[PDB]
Structure 1
Amino acid sequence: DDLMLALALADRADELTRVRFGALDLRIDTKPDLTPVTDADRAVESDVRQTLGRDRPGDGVLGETTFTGRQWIVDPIDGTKNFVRGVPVWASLIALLEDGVPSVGVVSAPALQRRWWAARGRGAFASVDARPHRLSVSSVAELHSASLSFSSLSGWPGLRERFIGLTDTVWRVRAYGDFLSYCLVAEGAVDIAAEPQVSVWDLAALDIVVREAGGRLTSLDGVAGPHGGSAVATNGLLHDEVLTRLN
């Protein structure tokens, strides 16, 4: 019901973001100008607000501060720095919060031809370009067997040294970055995802997807959910050992 609406919002967001991603000039000789991404961000937000005004009068809308009632939170493009360079790891993130708790989430990555979604009590799913498949986190129980995806080293000299130690301990390390690390945890394809500095707009949809897939997502101090300023997602089995190594 809210999930069906969230998936329809993602359909509309994808139509707008696809066109703007395709229209970019990717020739570049310096740091990229984020103006076309900001422009796309504004167009998606406007469309989302217009639809929710029609279909959910009296739901609040937050676009990338007080959490009350039913509130939709949208990050039209997560991975803006990828979007602007022509790297297709970017997605719209759409969540419904009830009293600040993600209850519906959609992660829509049109240039990866992929979507992930979840709703409380109804499981998590992914599609590639194409029937949905139900998601489940892995059963990897030992850190030395685990696969980890992060974003970069620079955001982490104590916590940096500890993070690098975790990367030396696990079986496999990659940095697919942003939302994609967390979505791969939910699919069971990766075991650990971590980012040291990340906002509620970037975590809300991922929180419900990971939880419905059987995993855990907490801040670095182990507090559940998307509000803690940092995010560690695991299959749940590895969670305590990861927080211990990082703390």
Structure 2
Amino acid sequence: PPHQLNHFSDVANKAANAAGDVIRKYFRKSPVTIADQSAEEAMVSVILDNFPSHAVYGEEKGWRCKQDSADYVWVLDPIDGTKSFITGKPLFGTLIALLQNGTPILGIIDQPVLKERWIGITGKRTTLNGQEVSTRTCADLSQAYLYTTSPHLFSGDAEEAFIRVRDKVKIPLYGCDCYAYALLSSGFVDLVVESGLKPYDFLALIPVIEGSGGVITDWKGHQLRWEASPLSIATSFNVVAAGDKQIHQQALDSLQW
């Protein structure tokens, strides 16, 4: 297992703290691009000051590393949910993931306006603001509360797949971004289904959801993996996350991907 997780947490939390400071000045005062750049720059200042050998892939400026390669890769998105940010809606989030040879070992979802921070760590239960959180059981897809960001954020076949699961759930809801994954981790949402998600908007979710007892994969039900390198391309993935493995299963059958 990894031995440096507490030290990784402290820098993780400082990165997140520094992103928050930038984000709160620009939220509700184009501010979004200044915010997104400054915030990313703030996080890499912290991460690279504490670990010079480490690499980062940020949503604004891609890969950045001194060395040829690194065993440790920081995948960042300061504002996951730019449309929410632009419209004054405080459900966007800063996402921080640390990858050890391509496996995520830490993830943060921070909401700096709501002052809510979910940390996921390998081999620990996921916490929200220092308190342990847990997904909830849910019998059947008909009992499930579902979130997706948008309906026409699906093209052609993805929209058919999505419709199939949509018709079976208790109620489909829209318009959290990453917050919906935070909510599911805390046991308030049963299922999140999305298409066209870039790595810096899902890698942080994995330890958060998994350490809460939930499951998150692609539409085929495979492990969400993205090996970040200097020669890495941020390509779209499809994501299904559930509080309950039975629900995940059942969702996978409706997706027919």
TM-score normalised by L of structure 1: 0.88
Aligned pair in 2 of structure 1 residues 217, 226: CA closer, same or farther (>3 Å)?
farther
In the TM superposition, what is the alpha-carbon distance from 1:226 to its structure 2 partner? 5.1
Aligned pair in 2 of structure 1 residues 69, 240: CA closer, same or farther (>3 Å)?
same
Q: Could you give the per-residue CA deviations for residues 47-99 of structure 1, whole angstroms, max 9, x where no partner exists?
A: 22222221112011110188851011110111111111111111111111111
User: 234, 243, 247: which is aligned to 1:238?
Assistant: 247
CA distance in 2, matches of 1:120, 1:202: 19
> Are 1:193 and 1:232, in contact at CA under 8 Å, matched by a contact in 2?
yes
User: 29, 34, 37: which is aligned to 2:32?
Assistant: 37
Moved over 6 A (4+): none
Q: Which deviates more, 87-96 or 66-75?
A: 66-75
Q: Which amino acid aligns with 1:84?
A: I
CA distance in 2, matches of 1:112, 1:193: 21
Q: Which amino acid aligns with 1:2?
A: F
Aligned pair in 2 of structure 1 residues 48, 168: CA closer, same or farther (>3 Å)?
same
Q: Could you give the per-residue CA deviations for residues 33-60 of structure 1, whole angstroms, max 9, x where no partner exists?
A: xx42121111112122222221112011
1:5 counterpart = 2:11: yes
Q: Which deviates more, 197-206 or 1-10?
A: 1-10
In the TM superposition, what is the alpha-carbon distance from 1:196 to its structure 2 partner? 1.0
Structure 2 counterpart of 1:71 = 73
RMSD over aligned Cα atoms: 1.8
CA distance in 1, matches of 2:239, 2:175: 15
> Are 1:196 and 1:220, in contact at CA under 8 Å, matched by a contact in 2?
no
Structure 2 counterpart of 1:93 = 95
1:145 counterpart = 2:143: yes
Q: Could you give the per-residue CA deviations for residues 11-50 of structure 1, whole angstroms, max 9, x where no partner exists?
A: 1111110011142xxxxxxxxxxx4212111111212222
> Are 1:218 and 1:226, in contact at CA under 8 Å, matched by a contact in 2?
no
Structure 2 counterpart of 1:202 = 201
> Are 1:124 and 1:135, in contact at CA under 8 Å, matched by a contact in 2?
yes
* Structure 1: gaps of 5 or more residues: 24-34
Alignment of 1:123-142 (within 5 A): 123-127=125-129, 132-142=130-140
Q: Which amino acid aligns with 1:195?
A: E
Structure 2 counterpart of 1:26 = none
> Are 2:53 and 2:70, in contact at CA under 8 Å, matched by a contact in 1?
no
In the TM superposition, what is the alpha-carbon distance from 1:237 to its structure 2 partner? 2.3
In the TM superposition, what is the alpha-carbon distance from 1:178 to its structure 2 partner? 1.5
> Are 1:63 and 1:75, in contact at CA under 8 Å, matched by a contact in 2?
yes
> Are 1:118 and 1:208, in contact at CA under 8 Å, matched by a contact in 2?
yes
* Structure 2: gaps of 5 or more residues: 1-6, 64-68, 227-235
CA distance in 2, matches of 1:233, 1:121: 20
In the TM superposition, what is the alpha-carbon distance from 1:221 to its structure 2 partner? 1.3
Secondary structure of residue in 2 paired with 1:197:
strand
Q: Which amino acid aligns with 1:58?
A: S
Q: Which amino acid aligns with 2:46?
A: T
Structure 1 counterpart of 2:24 = 18
Structure 1 counterpart of 2:159 = 160
CA distance in 2, matches of 1:226, 1:112: 30
CA distance in 1, matches of 2:27, 2:132: 29
Secondary structure of residue in 1 paired with 2:192:
strand
Secondary structure of residue in 1 paired with 2:123:
coil
CA distance in 2, matches of 1:68, 1:198: 24
In the alignment of these two chains, the number of paired residues is 232
Structure 2 counterpart of 1:224 = 223
Q: Which amino acid aligns with 1:108?
A: D
